Write a protein that binds this ligand. Structure first.
Ligand SMILES: [Mn+2]
Ligand SMILES: [Mn+2]
Lengths: 205, 205
């Protein structure tokens, strides 16, 4: 069974960029719900019930036709949010190999940020924006609802290993920024955990 | 060109059910954006710019490939929100032929409400829930993002003439209800404008 992961910091640890109220609701209400719904669906699927969530979402095609959608959405939600919490932290700095790769594939850090912001702002409806690693090159992509690049191109319309991502569902920014998603996107740069991003880039898997 | 319609009531006319702050943001920020984007796209299409928005969204397939998505989303947004504002009003009562038709196709008003709430609550991600008239029978359907049943089944996955609808994008309820969409759905029953719904049912088109 899946469980809500504990946060590696306090709910007000990302202030003054991401508000404490949202962090608490986002974690204890939204993420908790995905976990609860995924577990309920897996109760009748012993063969899949015990796989790590990141593995389950790479095998959605093997699931019974009547369970595929519920798990795609909720296991996807669990995987994405779990990655999100670990990918946030104040006071980090982009450096080393990751920075070099960024400048290499995007020309410069500023060009990268511009491309990421464009993808995050253009995602219509609910979705996520990602920095992925596809065949040794970094790229920016976005997915709908709670899909993940790990699900494959056929399902999510994207592929690649997620280095970092930004949740652009309205619940992630409405209390503090309301309709101003672009302002939320800019604040994100102050809390993106570059250390974790670097670690994932090094691992590659 | 489309004009942003003014609301048929003050921003606080739906209190204490729907909050004044959201009504103002929803109308002056979100709806305004859909109108702006739709007009920008229609600039080079004089032939389509003259049609009423409700008519334009039934002919999305006749638009040039590069204008189809932008207009589907934004013209859809304009059509849906325009209908939404007119469909809200306190103090109305479900009666007459509309009530009879509801009880006829759903067995009872309570059964209808249950079906509508289920559709509104189960829509994952951004979307709308609708009470539509297909031929001579009433039915409950839901669409993704800013699609409308008027767009046809091929595009939206649903069809029928909209009698009334509920916006379930998180911006419609997050400030007051946060994650509690079910509470928002319940409050809706207090502000659904049954007089307008009856009028649309009578016109049948
Ligand atoms: Mn989220
Ligand atoms: Mn809306």
């Amino acid at each position: 069974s899946y469980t809500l992961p504990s946060l590696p910091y306090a709910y007000d640890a990302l202030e003054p960029h991401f508000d404490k109220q949202t962090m608490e609701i986002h974690h204890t209400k939204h993420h908790q719900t995905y976990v609860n719904n995924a577990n309920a669906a897996l109760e009748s699927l012993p063969e899949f019930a015990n796989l790590p969530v990141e593995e389950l979402i790479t095998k959605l095609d093997q699931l019974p036709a009547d369970k595929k959608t519920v798990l795609r959405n909720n296991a996807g939600g669990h995987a994405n949010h779990s990655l999100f919490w670990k990918g946030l932290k104040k006071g980090t700095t982009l450096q080393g190999d990751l920075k070099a790769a960024i400048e290499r594939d995007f020309g410069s850090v500023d060009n990268f940020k511009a491309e990421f912001e464009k993808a995050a702002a253009s995602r219509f409806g609910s979705g996520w924006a990602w920095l992925v690693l596809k065949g040794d090159k970094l790229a920016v992509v976005s997915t709908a609802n709670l899909d993940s690049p790990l699900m494959g191109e056929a399902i999510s319309g994207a592929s690649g290993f997620p280095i970092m991502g930004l949740d652009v569902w309205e619940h992630a920014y409405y209390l503090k920024f309301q309709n101003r998603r672009p302002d939320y996107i800019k604040e994100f740069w102050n809390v993106v955990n570059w250390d974790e991003a670097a670690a994932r880039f090094a691992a590659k898997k």
